[PDB]
Design a protein around this ligand. Structure first.
Ligand SMILES: COc1cc([C@@H](C(=O)N2CCCC[C@H]2C(=O)OCc2scnc2Cl)C2CCCCC2)cc(OC)c1OC
Length: 128
């Protein structure tokens, strides 16, 4: 499945090089600009536990998910991963617990020590 493919082919985009956040570009975006810390970022995404027990999508409200990059308003993996993306890009992320919800988890939605997978489309980003 797509998570296994990221294990097998994904680039490690962590600074520590601990394979905590692995990425595959699934559709190339446009231009050279990737977002900076503080930019307002608009995405669609589909997310699940690596297990496959819970599944979440922005496409539920067919409404983009919006956040300010690099302010830790989302899990660290997203701050790291969305920062690497170009407008119009779609990417897969596979995420070790240290860059998501850790040993504590976020019960009852996210168990302890959970690995997460996401497909993310970067729709737009704009300066604050
Ligand atoms: C931990 O709580 C939540 C986590 C998520 C999902 C999630 O982990 N995220 C949602 C999209 C941004 C990345 C990441 C996250 O930071 O979510 C919590 C945040 S932080 C700002 N808004 C949200 Cl929602 C889970 C992904 C895997 C399968 C279950 C959901 C959506 C949630 O609700 C839509 C949510 O409740 C707030």
């Amino acid at each position: 499945g797509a998570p296994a493919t990221v294990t097998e082919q994904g680039e490690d985009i962590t600074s520590k090089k601990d394979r905590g956040v692995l990425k595959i570009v699934k559709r190339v975006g446009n231009g050279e600009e990737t977002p900076m810390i503080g930019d307002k970022v608009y995405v669609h995404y589909k997310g699940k536990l690596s297990n496959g027990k819970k599944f979440d999508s922005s496409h539920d409200r067919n409404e983009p998910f919006v956040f300010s990059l690099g302010k830790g308003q989302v899990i660290k993996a997203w701050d790291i991963g969305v920062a690497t993306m170009k407008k119009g890009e779609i990417a897969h992320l596979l995420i070790k617990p240290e860059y998501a919800y850790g040993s504590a988890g976020s019960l009852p939605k996210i168990p302890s020590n959970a690995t997460l997978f996401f497909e993310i489309e970067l729709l737009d980003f704009k300066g604050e």
